[model samples]
Target: TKCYVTPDATSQTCPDGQDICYTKTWCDGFCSSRGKRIDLGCAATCPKVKPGVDIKCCSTDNCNPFPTWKRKH
Candidate 1:
């Protein structure tokens, strides 16, 4: 399985100061990687895939870690 970062993920904090980092509003499809996961720290918007799935992380303007992909198959 593999993970791919998505676009639109921003690092702008929420109006409530909850650190609106990443959100699952950028998933293209279901991750097929085996046990793949992503972490945006403080705040992360990742998909909740079934077991044996990969995860990705993405970022945008005012973003910190940009977009990134990983494989956990």
Candidate 2:
């Protein structure tokens, strides 16, 4: 599984211009630019299927905690 920070514009326009954020793990699957955040679960062999979240966008002005998760084996 891999994680990556997508471009601001790409992340911003995600979910079809919807304001959402997704982890790099979510980008490895069939992702479309129709939604803001989409969890692809590519990091884990058995990824967790879930919808994305509309959190505060992390930018120069926005100071937020990094999104993290642990895989259960």
Candidate 3:
């Protein structure tokens, strides 16, 4: 499978043993722009995060959205 890598909206094949695309976002409202920080990549398993952090995982190619992409509630 493929996933979107960080630093931009670029994409690449998932490494061996990693088959899912993941995104991690943080919002402290201090150092982050508009109080949001987002990153994307491939992962074998998504993480369990605490409050103030947002994470998601998907199994399709480039399923993760870019940092600048707005989300609808």
Candidate 4:
């Protein structure tokens, strides 16, 4: 399963394993965007698969939605 953070979210659930990394990205009001990634289980505290917190493909329902993809040609 895969997911992504929206351009207007604050945070999103993520994978929290040693090699399982976490990346968060978002856009501002317009053409501004930035992102950050972290290895949880290795870089910090390991994560738990809580019901509403972190999860598998937890983006769409994790507090929001990402912009609709402009389908490829």
Candidate 5:
């Protein structure tokens, strides 16, 4: 799979064993713009990061994008 991996956004093929693309955005620190700080990469599963981050995962290449606050379920 492919993923966008950088603060500036660069698409690249994921290393072996990585099966999904993920977008992790900061949910704190900047209330004025919740989406200002973000990270994109590939992972086998979506990780639940520390308290201030919103993480979303997708299977398609480059499918991970800045996500909304609503829970998926």
Candidate 6:
């Protein structure tokens, strides 16, 4: 598995139930990748980030970081 589940407000990690990586680029975060598995070469079904973020998934840990789109852009 290229990535594991990062749900249940893990604060970024899942001990027994391992979890990727989602967070806030300018506020509270959500995309956690603490214990997420690794499914290298797989595509995630996420909405395109702002500013001009490409739509894709992460193959490594915490690949999904935070939104870095310029708010005023």
**Candidates 1 and 3 compared by lDDT, better number:** 3
lDDT of 1 by residue, 1-73 (tens): 1122332343343333233344333333456332213433334555566524434334433344334444211
Please write out the lDDT profile of model 3 over residues 1-73, one tens digit for every residue.
5555343434445555246777676653356654236565566467685445766677766564444323411
Q: Supply the global lDDT for candidate 3.
A: 0.55
All candidates: TM-score:
0.22, 0.18, 0.48, 0.20, 0.46, 0.21
Better of 3 and 4 by TM-score: 3
Write the number of the candidate with greater lDDT, choosing between 5 and 6: 5
Tens digits of lDDT, candidate 2, 1-73: 1222333322222233222233432353235443324342222223234534322233222123233222111
lDDT of each: 0.37, 0.30, 0.55, 0.29, 0.54, 0.32
The parts of candidate 2 lying over 4 Å away from their true place are 1-53, 61-63, 71-73
For model 4, the stretches where C-alpha displacement exceeds 4 angstroms are 4-23, 32-65, 71-73
List where candidate 3 sits over 4 angstroms from the true fold: 5-18, 28-36, 47-52, 64-66, 69-73
Q: How close is candidate 5 to the true structure, as a TM-score?
A: 0.46
What TM-score does candidate 2 reach?
0.18
Q: List the residue pairs that clash in candidate 1.
A: 1-33, 2-33, 22-45
Best-fitting candidate, measured by TM-score?
3
Q: Select the stronger candidate by lDDT from 2 and 6.
A: 6
Tell me the lDDT of model 1 at 48.
Answer: 63
CA deviation > 4 Å runs, candidate 6: 1-7, 11-54, 67-73
What's model 5's lDDT at 68?
Answer: 28
Q: Where is model 6 poorest over a 10-residue stretch in terms of lDDT?
A: 18-27
Candidate 4 TM-score, true structure as reference: 0.20
Superposed on all Cα atoms, the candidates' RMSDs to the truth, in angstroms, are 10.2, 12.9, 5.0, 10.5, 6.7, 11.5
Tell me the tens digit of each residue's lDDT in model 4 across 1-73: 1223332333333334323223322333244323222111112322454333332223222323333323211
Candidate 1 vs candidate 4: the lDDT winner is: 1
Q: State how far residue 58 of model 5 sits from its true place (Å).
A: 0.1
Clashing pairs in 3: none
Error of model 4, residue 18, in angstroms: 15
